[PDB]
Design a binder for this molecule. Sequence first.
Ligand SMILES: CC(C)=CCC/C(C)=C\CC/C(C)=C/CC/C(C)=C\CC/C(C)=C/CC/C(C)=C/CC/C(C)=C/CC/C(C)=C/CC/C(C)=C/CC1=C(C)C(=O)c2ccccc2C1=O
Ligand code: SF4
Ligand code: SF4
Ligand code: SF4
Ligand code: SF4
Ligand code: FES
Lengths: 183, 125, 220, 406, 165, 187
Amino acid sequence: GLEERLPGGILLSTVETVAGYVRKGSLWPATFGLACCAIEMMSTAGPRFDIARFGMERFSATPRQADLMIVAGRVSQKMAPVLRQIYDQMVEPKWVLAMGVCASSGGMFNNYAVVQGVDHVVPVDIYLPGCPPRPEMLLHAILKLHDKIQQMPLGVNREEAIREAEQAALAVPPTIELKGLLR
Amino acid sequence: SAPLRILVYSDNPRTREQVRLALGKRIHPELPEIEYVDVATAPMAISQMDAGGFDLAILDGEATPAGGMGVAKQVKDEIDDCPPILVLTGRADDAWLAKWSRAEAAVPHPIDPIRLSDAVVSLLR
Amino acid sequence: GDEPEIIAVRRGMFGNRDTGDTSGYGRLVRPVALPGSTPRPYGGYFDAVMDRLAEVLGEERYAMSIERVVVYRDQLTIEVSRVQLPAVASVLRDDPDLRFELCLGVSGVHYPEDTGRELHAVYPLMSITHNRRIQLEVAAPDADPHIPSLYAVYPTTDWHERETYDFFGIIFDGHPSLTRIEMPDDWEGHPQRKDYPLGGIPVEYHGAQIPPPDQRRSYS
Amino acid sequence: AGERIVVNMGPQHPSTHGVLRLILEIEGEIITEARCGIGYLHTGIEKNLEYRNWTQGVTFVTRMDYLSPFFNETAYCLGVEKLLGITDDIPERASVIRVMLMELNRISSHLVALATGGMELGAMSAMFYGFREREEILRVFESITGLRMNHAYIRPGGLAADLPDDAITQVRRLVEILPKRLKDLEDLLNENYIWKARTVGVGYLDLTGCMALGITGPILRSTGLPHDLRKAQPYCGYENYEFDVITDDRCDSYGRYIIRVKEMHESVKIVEQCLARLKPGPVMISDKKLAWPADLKLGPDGLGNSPEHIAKIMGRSMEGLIHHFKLVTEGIRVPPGQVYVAVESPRGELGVHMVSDGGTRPYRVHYRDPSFTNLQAVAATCEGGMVADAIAAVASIDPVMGGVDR
Amino acid sequence: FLDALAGFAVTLGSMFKKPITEGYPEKPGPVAPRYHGRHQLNRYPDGLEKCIGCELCAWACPADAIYVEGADNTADERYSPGERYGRVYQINYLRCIGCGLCIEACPTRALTMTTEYEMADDNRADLIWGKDKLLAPLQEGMQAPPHDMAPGKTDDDYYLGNVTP
Amino acid sequence: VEMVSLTIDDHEISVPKGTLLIRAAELMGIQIPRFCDHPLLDPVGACRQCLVEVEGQRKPMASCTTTVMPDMVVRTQFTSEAADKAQRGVMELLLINHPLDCPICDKGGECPLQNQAMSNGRPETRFEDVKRTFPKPISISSQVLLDRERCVLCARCTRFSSQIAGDPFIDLMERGALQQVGIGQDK
Ligand SMILES: CC(C)=CCC/C(C)=C\CC/C(C)=C/CC/C(C)=C\CC/C(C)=C/CC/C(C)=C/CC/C(C)=C/CC/C(C)=C/CC/C(C)=C/CC1=C(C)C(=O)c2ccccc2C1=O
Ligand code: SF4
Ligand code: SF4
Ligand code: SF4
Ligand code: SF4
Ligand code: FES
């Protein structure tokens, strides 16, 4: 959008900060949930907690209105195409919260049927441990995503950030090479 | 001839090194020289694909923040006249998803140099 | 029949599936037999159920249909010979004294070491009227994994014959449409067969990874 | 013929629980054919069980039909114990706590069913009030087990640990407040004109249909048949409890909803009985060859094996150390055999076919989950009605897809 | 006849009752004392690590979420009483299911589970917590783990609880 | 080859003449606990763990040393209370001096002593006295560490180093409860 054509002066910085504040608030989750993690997501929406306090009570039934896709449960092989379709049918900017161990790495179900982490099919922004994560853990992960969204760049700043993140990522060794103290 | 440009996508630098080792400067002396563009992050890979000028993309299905199969589906849905996509699968059972990603070819981990080279030749031929 | 049904031959002490960690303990040979034919005075109402089934079915038909009778942990299993399954199922459902109207489903179990009887289908039946229950067991070889579908007798077996098929390849001949219900139709293999690998991936750690449990050593 | 659309209720839909796929041929907005698409939540739990020991597959089974964790755990543990021939050796306190937790879990699962059904049918505050009550129930569950869901608290031969000293008081408070707070939820729905109009006569299924599809639970008992596995084929000592099998004669969605609402009160009564009969004693079989050796206790460093158990195993008892090591690592060995054990889960007969090959791992564990069988009634309870009626019918079926796919 | 309107009387009533929401994150709610929070590797009062690296926690884990590598407690560098200590100890919290089988498995109580739960990261690797992140903080009276055992004490004394700062 | 009929427990089988009772039980699927027995080592009958009741014998017979004889009737721990009592008492005596080292023991999980104490041992200790102790571990070579406290003195190592390999550089040393596998000196 034209907000991405703005010059990199103070104008772009203020547009970025206001857009981040606006998007961190009103972060409507998609009406999407796979398993017991979906039950904990509902509990988070439930009175004991209040997802609504964060402007996130409107679980967008359609992906068009959804801004955040809380996977919230295990993703089977047959479901990955559906989850990717839902992700693609959301409109940018989009974010994916991998709620629970099943959504983030497959969790305990390390077998043929489970995808072993939704990042196999959709870009994940935050991983949320737990099986299921208790609602406070979900709110913590959501606030972490809010912090990430606030510092989200735009336009030329976005391009520079992408280049810098690429440069940093090209150098990190794989986890299999962090042999610290391994005999 | 035009140096065929290949996009190698993997958060794991060793997977990129293995892919570049299987495919030398020339897969065969009959084929053109090969230039490799290494991308570790999905945003960079997507932007490179949008810039175009690639003859093949090797996407690691095991890439941490964004899997190669997802990126393959995204590029074949978002880039017009996108190049053939080769996906590296972390397990045999991933084959189904490899088919879903519509990748022209799938090469299981660990990357067999010869299997990868043959698949690349088939895709470029 | 009439002999114990050995489903696996376990050799070596300590449940080693291979040569074994300590020398000299691998020479034991213990066949793993499931409970065999029960002596005739079955417990509780099982005696009445079997007597009624043998009365409704002719002596010849009963002998041809009922391959075995087992009473294990106060639960009655009837090894029903393949082919004859629909007839005995109809008798069980319709006979007023049996009246097993509620079939709870079909469960597949794979015995790769049970020659000629690798694939077993288990039919848990319950009679609400008599507050009774039993299980039928139908064995089929891995070579011809065909069983008569009970769709006409127990429509509830629909989707079960499918799940059991999807996960074992038992063909349940005569089923209206035996299509995969859990796995995708393009899926290759039947996951719950023992020969089908678990299909996991190594768990990633800093500097190391743990292979899936099916690859790592186990004792049974 | 050519004037009817075919649409996907699809996995991603508010009323389809995210993984259920109703494919509806709608002539205008009347459901003409209703195909059911399953497996979007298949998980390989049944196969993955086979590579873990007993007392470990518990953590697996509690995650299929995740709204009824204690029911899955109890079915699994009853199967294991029956294979062991240990069902009569389980401590009385363990059985009483099992019944108490199963009934509290029945209340919780019915609360989730009512919440999601009301949300699907527009009853927005129904979800919040149901989850407010479920919040107290889950507080009790967390205090007892340390987890809000997917508890692994019920273990082969008893429980994972004894109740905390405050557990009895919390459960008594639940017995006191649950009826009053369920009054709020019932007032929103029970006599509401819109709720009744939206569910009365919807999703009809006669007793013949229930038998033909093998339906069970509130759907079957909405036909007036008082079939309940707790009275018929009692388990965990349910025979010692005075409670009435809730059953209705409407055979429709509203009848099933009322059955669930009344089952909540029956569960409250059973929990009061459990508290009356709850007496101090062991919660795990006395046989040290099978008993779970762990002794969890709290301290300033958190929850962990009690210092007394540490002293016993690492300081003085070689036999104790060997038993702890083996029962924790390999686990018990279950004599070879087959056993089919059934319980009355909130959604109907939850059956478990358990086959042991004599090893330390379950050779085969199949769950006949009531939701899997009940979903076969979607065609009967949806064809002919409107899509709005299909939503109510499916919600009345109350399918938890974890149990459906497993 | 007013019974059909009972629901109204409910909601309106609740509109005047104080909301019951826990004030997380500003005022986090009280978790159960027994809650299955983050695993924690504990120390003896003198600072020695309790973990002997027996791998029983990892053995019992249904999700293979624990990786443990033992090593010898050489006199030059001792970390735990006895012959073995767990020098590498990693928990993959993206595989942990919080079941608690690990703590029930430990024969030393080296592994407990706290009530702390706030945990999440944008990176998969960052959620594989190593020994440094899991070890309990060094309390008052404790010493650096690489030190000899308490004077006139043996492993049995540590397990019997007869050690002091 | 001569073949002798035999009855183990209530079951009957026929085995080649000269077969050991433990081998016959193995072929029949009966698991008799054993430490010192080894199929490839000449039987020594030391640990006394493999005791069974034989008709016509007053004392329990070490199945690892008792050759099968025709018409012999043998009842293992599965069908003889005396045999079970003997085996469990032997296990208890085997465990009284054993170190509480299972978590740190390399053999843990793969230990025949653990498995046979589970299957043939008392659930808890009666031994409230002081355990016998040795300095542990001691190297007998560049490759092999020896933990004499865990040693059940089954002599399998020594019997191998003598019979199978002609390298008897380890032997049982000292006497009584102090007995230990050793190399004698720096050699
Ligand atoms: C042009 C311009 C800028 C002009 C200047 C002026 C200006 C700025 C604008 C003027 C004002 C405007 C137009 C403002 C824009 C905003 C606007 C118009 C409106 C949007 C905001 C809005 C409509 C607010 C109210 C919305 C509202 C009432 C929200 C509440 C919704 C609720 C109650 C949500 C809770 C839902 C919930 C419980 C979620 C869980 C979903 C789950 C769990 C999904 C998966 C799942 C399900 C669905 C189960 O039910 C289930 C059941 C059992 C087992 C498993 C599952 C399972 O897996
Ligand atoms: S992470 Fe745990 S709670 Fe979430 S879907 Fe997986 S098993 Fe269920
Ligand atoms: S944490 Fe406990 S169980 Fe795990 S290695 Fe350390 S002492 Fe053993
Ligand atoms: S809580 Fe359970 S899954 Fe998590 S590390 Fe401990 S034993 Fe493993
Ligand atoms: S060291 Fe030798 S005598 Fe001692 S237990 Fe081992 S094999 Fe037997
Ligand atoms: S094994 Fe026969 S006496 Fe030791």
